[PDB]
Amino acid sequence: HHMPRSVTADASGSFLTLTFEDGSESRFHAIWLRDNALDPETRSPGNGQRLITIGDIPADTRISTALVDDGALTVTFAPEGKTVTFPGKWLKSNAYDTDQSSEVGRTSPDVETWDSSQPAPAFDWNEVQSDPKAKRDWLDAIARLGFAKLVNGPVREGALIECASMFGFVRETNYGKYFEVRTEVNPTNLAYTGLGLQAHTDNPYRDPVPSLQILYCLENSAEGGDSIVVDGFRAAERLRDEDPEGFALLAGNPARFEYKGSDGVHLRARRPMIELSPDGEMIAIRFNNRSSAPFVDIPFEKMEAYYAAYRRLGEFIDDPEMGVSFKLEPGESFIVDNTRVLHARLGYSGSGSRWLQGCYADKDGLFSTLNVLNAQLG
Amino acid sequence: HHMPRSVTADASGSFLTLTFEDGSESRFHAIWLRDNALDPETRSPGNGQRLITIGDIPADTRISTALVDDGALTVTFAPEGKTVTFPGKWLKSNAYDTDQSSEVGRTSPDVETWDSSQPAPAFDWNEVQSDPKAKRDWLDAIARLGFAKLVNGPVREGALIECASMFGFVRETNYGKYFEVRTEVNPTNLAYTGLGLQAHTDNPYRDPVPSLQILYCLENSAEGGDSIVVDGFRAAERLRDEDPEGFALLAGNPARFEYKGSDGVHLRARRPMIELSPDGEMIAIRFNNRSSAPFVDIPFEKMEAYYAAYRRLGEFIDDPEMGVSFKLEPGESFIVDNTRVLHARLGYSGSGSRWLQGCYADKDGLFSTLNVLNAQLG
Ligand SMILES: C[N+](C)(C)C[C@H](O)P(=O)(O)O
Ligand SMILES: [Fe+2]
Ligand SMILES: [Fe+2]
């Protein structure tokens, strides 16, 4: 099935049809094959960079001659007269003559959505540093599920920056490379500190949104206040399955977010609460009650139904059965994919203090590190 | 103009229609007005953040009474019995009943597109550093035009980091805090050679894409090495106006991008070459011949047309009448909005030396700095 058997070219030379040993067929256009040639004059052997532009490829490029031999495809292009070969495995892996799904709001096959039945993934600080398999599994959990907990870390200021550096790079803001989250819980504030905060993604007013968030515990002597995570993709899925028109409104119209502090910070963004790829795949969630700004982009005739959908998404986010809760002891931390997984805490149940440190990092670095680890372990 | 004259409420109480003194009308829904109330129980007086969730607003919310007085609208909401006042100017500025354009591929009102007919805007290093009016003008140019030169700067290694610090924060990547743009033996990227490069946006394989790039000249004494910038929005507009089907193909299907230039890095992204907001406004351009990966997300029946559109976009990008060309002197630099404005360079050779330094920053910080300067200067 990854082993090519034979090939036929069209009389035009505009495409060819590759038949594999299992009977399956896959068609490839001449232009696509020429642009994706893997030979040293198309792709630099040293760095993999393509050496030619689309403009460099003759617009009348066609397949002149083609043949399957010993697991590979030989193709010669006219009018260049250029012969290249493609390994069979590569052609199958990079095929586009497939039945690509067009389901609106579908999740990527790489991710798995969850509710309160999902245990919090937990990994050991020392093991992820010394065991590449543990590191791979830690980062893979953040990739697939959008969060993971790291335990047995050092009780040291700035330790979260060391965590970030294990896979990527910190998104520095006006607040610094990291920020302090100090809480004092006492009878004078327990009326409000004793209630939970609505789950949210951080900084939807930043474009580009910081794509990972790390929260790291240094001190905890206050009862309750468990951290909680909610899968924005699951909330969005539930809306879509119940109410596809409401989902389409939240995906089809941008919201506005703003943070205009008294500390000389003024951040604004214009993005939808549910962000889809142009072919319908769900790629990001932005939900934060505190920084939502006037919605000026939604037409008058859609505003009521938009608000109804918005309210419904909030109910799914507020649903106790959607939240995964956990304790953070000193030296423990968690990361969330801040383009997907919302976070908050439950109410505090007793007096004391807490000291967390917070920072942002970016997913591209995490995915790169994961890719490198998979290649090293594969 | 923004002075309310009169108001009518709908029979349902679901919206009101505000008539201003110039005869213009604007409708506002009960739910939208309630959610946007500016009073101390809905919005913090200290930081302007929202103190309610969408779920806190009653399900039955409607307008019980509404009156115009002292250039403002006073509205009472049932069932809360909550009365709030909206200034006339606030209502005009935050109106959504504005007959929003649905022109696909339109640019934001805040940007202005360009070609080779406008000389490069240039600002002075010492002026932007000391004079906040000059800084504001420089940053506003980058915001509106996506491009500005900064000249008469220091011939010093790392000076670009000082430049970044004038408005925001460096996005550190695999390439470093900053990178050395010079010929390297065993280059990790074709930028590190003497070759000419087609106009491109940096790192389309990175998601999130770096939103700003700084390029800073230390040496440019070889024959060639001229810089060219191209407005990707202008190129996209031309394709839109000439060939709406081709524009739709590039906006409606994701491309793939990949960089694996050495061991220890493997960056991938799945994004369209033309990114639109869900309401059709142009958001971003991603275009890079060197790191475009096999396009696997485009149906077989659309791939030929997709490539034709990609070719045509490339022709607009390569058009000499689109490119703004200059050769940097030591201590001169430029910034591009890397989500919009492409940069290129001509190959260099012979005696002499070329040495540029590059780094990434983010637009969110630039806009905040600009927003703060605008407040402080008026
Ligand atoms: C090497 N680099 C200058 C940092 C990036 C390249 O210009 P690319 O974004 O085209 O790969
Ligand atoms: Fe938060
Ligand atoms: Fe570049």
Side-chain angles (χ1 to χ4, degrees):
Chain A
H1 52 105
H2 289 257
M3 180 57 63
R5 183 161 70 204
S6 63
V7 66
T8 68
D10 195 80
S12 64
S14 68
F15 69 99
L16 53 77
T17 308
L18 181 60
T19 305
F20 292 89
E21 284 295 340
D22 71 336
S24 66
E25 300 188 341
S26 194
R27 297 170 289 171
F28 296 87
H29 291 288
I31 189 58
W32 188 98
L33 291 166
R34 178 63 190 100
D35 194 29
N36 289 298
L38 303 172
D39 69 290
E41 307 287 2
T42 308
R43 288 279 179 178
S44 165
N47 57 45
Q49 294 253 97
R50 190 189 275 97
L51 293 161
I52 61 176
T53 66
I54 187 66
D56 292 331
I57 299 169
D60 60 342
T61 291
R62 57 183 171 82
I63 297 145
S64 179
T65 305
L67 188 73
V68 167
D69 178 66
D70 192 18
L73 173 63
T74 302
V75 182
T76 307
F77 299 105
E80 281 176 284
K82 190 181 165 60
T83 295
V84 308
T85 55
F86 292 94
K89 287 218 308 311
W90 188 92
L91 294 159
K92 189 70 166 202
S93 296
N94 297 103
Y96 63 96
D97 187 23
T98 58
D99 195 52
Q100 292 108 327
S101 180
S102 59
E103 188 190 345
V104 176
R106 70 184 181 281
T107 52
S108 175
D110 304 329
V111 301
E112 187 184 331
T113 61
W114 47 265
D115 61 23
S116 67
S117 62
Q118 175 61 51
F123 301 87
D124 177 271
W125 177 275
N126 299 307
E127 292 179 13
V128 298
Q129 291 182 257
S130 60
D131 184 353
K133 178 57 179 161
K135 195 177 177 174
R136 179 266 172 194
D137 292 348
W138 170 50
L139 300 184
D140 188 63
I142 297 159
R144 290 183 299 103
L145 302 167
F147 79 114
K149 191 175 168 179
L150 200 57
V151 303
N152 300 135
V155 182
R156 172 171 61 241
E157 289 174 64
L160 81 173
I161 302 295
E162 298 165 40
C163 178
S165 300
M166 295 171 187
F167 61 80
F169 301 92
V170 170
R171 184 86 76 81
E172 184 179 9
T173 70
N174 50 284
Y175 301 113
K177 294 204 179 190
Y178 66 89
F179 51 87
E180 311 289 3
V181 183
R182 294 181 159 286
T183 308
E184 286 294 341
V185 187
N186 61 37
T188 303
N189 66 49
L190 271 163
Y192 62 93
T193 60
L195 285 161
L197 283 42
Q198 187 174 59
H200 55 279
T201 57
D202 261 31
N203 302 9
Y205 47 82
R206 290 184 186 274
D207 201 343
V209 63
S211 53
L212 298 168
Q213 181 169 359
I214 317 193
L215 282 170
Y216 199 108
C217 180
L218 299 177
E219 191 266 324
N220 183 38
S221 59
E223 209 72 47
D226 284 7
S227 303
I228 180 153
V229 292
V230 175
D231 189 358
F233 287 178
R234 176 49 66 81
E237 277 175 346
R238 290 180 71 187
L239 185 61
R240 184 193 49 151
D241 296 347
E242 189 183 83
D243 187 356
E245 291 178 17
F247 179 88
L249 288 164
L250 297 190
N253 299 273
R256 293 275 184 162
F257 302 93
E258 184 180 66
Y259 177 87
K260 184 174 163 64
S262 198
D263 61 337
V265 182
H266 189 14
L267 296 159
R268 291 150 151 171
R270 179 189 194 276
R271 290 291 191 159
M273 296 193 201
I274 303 172
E275 188 187 347
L276 306 181
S277 65
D279 66 326
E281 197 182 79
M282 189 161 49
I283 66 185
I285 303 296
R286 294 173 180 75
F287 196 90
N288 190 308
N289 76 287
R290 297 192 57 75
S291 56
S292 300
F295 306 156
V296 302
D297 307 295
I298 304 164
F300 183 81
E301 295 79 6
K302 296 178 173 174
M303 188 64 82
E304 285 194 298
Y306 181 96
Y307 261 89
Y310 171 25
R311 184 183 176 81
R312 189 57 180 153
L313 187 64
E315 292 168 3
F316 291 129
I317 291 163
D318 291 342
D319 182 0
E321 298 190 339
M322 295 277 285
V324 173
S325 64
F326 52 89
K327 305 262 173 201
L328 284 182
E329 304 291 329
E332 301 185 338
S333 59
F334 75 103
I335 294 168
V336 289
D337 179 345
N338 191 55
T339 68
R340 177 191 166 180
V341 176
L342 292 65
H343 71 285
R345 53 157 186 77
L346 300 179
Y348 288 96
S349 60
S351 297
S353 59
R354 187 170 289 178
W355 185 11
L356 309 182
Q357 302 193 313
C359 78
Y360 305 112
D362 285 299
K363 292 168 67 169
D364 60 289
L366 187 147
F367 289 133
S368 177
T369 301
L370 181 52
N371 291 335
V372 169
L373 288 167
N374 286 326
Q376 286 168 352
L377 296 164
Chain B
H1 56 296
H2 65 74
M3 274 292 305
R5 184 161 66 199
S6 56
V7 61
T8 66
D10 195 62
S12 55
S14 72
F15 69 91
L16 53 76
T17 306
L18 190 55
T19 297
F20 297 95
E21 288 289 352
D22 63 344
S24 60
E25 299 185 345
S26 194
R27 297 168 291 175
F28 293 87
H29 285 100
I31 191 60
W32 188 97
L33 291 165
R34 178 59 191 96
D35 198 33
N36 283 287
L38 302 170
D39 70 287
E41 298 184 34
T42 315
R43 286 277 175 177
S44 171
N47 61 26
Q49 292 285 94
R50 185 160 159 269
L51 301 168
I52 55 154
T53 66
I54 188 58
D56 294 327
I57 300 169
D60 199 19
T61 293
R62 59 212 179 287
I63 296 148
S64 55
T65 186
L67 61 89
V68 171
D69 193 52
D70 298 1
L73 177 66
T74 296
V75 187
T76 304
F77 299 104
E80 277 169 295
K82 184 172 177 66
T83 303
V84 304
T85 302
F86 295 99
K89 71 193 171 295
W90 187 96
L91 289 161
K92 196 76 180 194
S93 311
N94 294 106
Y96 62 96
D97 184 26
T98 60
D99 191 26
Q100 290 94 330
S101 178
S102 61
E103 190 200 353
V104 178
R106 69 185 179 282
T107 55
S108 176
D110 306 333
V111 303
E112 175 180 359
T113 64
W114 47 266
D115 69 359
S116 77
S117 68
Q118 309 81 359
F123 295 82
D124 180 87
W125 178 273
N126 292 136
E127 292 300 316
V128 303
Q129 186 145 279
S130 42
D131 188 352
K133 202 171 69 172
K135 184 187 277 195
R136 184 267 303 280
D137 292 345
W138 169 56
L139 297 181
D140 195 49
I142 295 164
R144 296 183 50 254
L145 303 167
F147 165 66
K149 291 175 68 179
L150 192 61
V151 301
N152 308 316
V155 186
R156 201 205 325 121
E157 290 178 63
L160 80 174
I161 301 302
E162 188 177 349
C163 181
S165 299
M166 297 171 185
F167 62 85
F169 303 96
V170 172
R171 184 96 74 81
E172 183 173 353
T173 72
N174 62 292
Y175 292 117
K177 188 179 197 322
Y178 63 86
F179 46 89
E180 311 288 11
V181 182
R182 61 190 175 195
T183 298
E184 301 287 5
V185 303
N186 304 327
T188 62
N189 190 286
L190 300 185
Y192 306 144
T193 71
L195 298 164
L197 304 175
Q198 186 183 41
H200 58 281
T201 56
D202 260 26
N203 305 7
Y205 46 81
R206 196 186 305 285
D207 193 353
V209 69
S211 60
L212 295 168
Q213 186 175 170
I214 314 188
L215 282 165
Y216 199 108
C217 175
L218 295 175
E219 303 179 40
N220 216 354
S221 66
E223 179 60 29
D226 306 61
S227 296
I228 306 97
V229 294
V230 179
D231 187 354
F233 288 176
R234 181 56 82 80
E237 281 177 337
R238 290 181 73 185
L239 186 66
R240 180 198 67 200
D241 294 343
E242 184 187 280
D243 190 343
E245 295 170 77
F247 184 85
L249 287 161
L250 301 186
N253 297 273
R256 295 276 183 160
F257 300 96
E258 182 175 38
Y259 174 75
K260 197 205 280 175
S262 65
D263 297 349
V265 62
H266 189 185
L267 292 158
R268 289 188 282 202
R270 176 188 195 273
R271 289 292 192 159
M273 298 194 192
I274 302 179
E275 191 189 339
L276 305 180
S277 62
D279 64 325
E281 193 174 275
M282 273 208 295
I283 286 179
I285 304 297
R286 289 172 183 79
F287 187 95
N288 196 306
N289 77 289
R290 290 167 293 110
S291 55
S292 297
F295 304 154
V296 298
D297 307 292
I298 303 158
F300 182 83
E301 298 79 20
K302 294 179 172 179
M303 186 65 79
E304 292 169 284
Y306 183 92
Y307 261 95
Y310 178 33
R311 180 178 294 280
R312 193 76 189 112
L313 185 60
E315 290 166 355
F316 291 132
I317 289 164
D318 292 339
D319 188 355
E321 300 197 311
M322 293 282 287
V324 171
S325 188
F326 51 95
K327 186 166 178 173
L328 293 170
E329 312 268 57
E332 300 185 337
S333 62
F334 68 95
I335 290 177
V336 289
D337 177 347
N338 189 59
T339 71
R340 173 192 168 181
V341 175
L342 288 63
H343 64 285
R345 60 132 197 265
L346 303 181
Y348 60 94
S349 190
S351 190
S353 283
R354 194 170 187 271
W355 185 13
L356 271 61
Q357 305 191 304
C359 76
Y360 306 120
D362 282 297
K363 291 171 73 179
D364 63 333
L366 187 146
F367 291 137
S368 186
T369 300
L370 176 56
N371 284 337
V372 171
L373 289 162
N374 284 334
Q376 293 179 356
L377 295 165

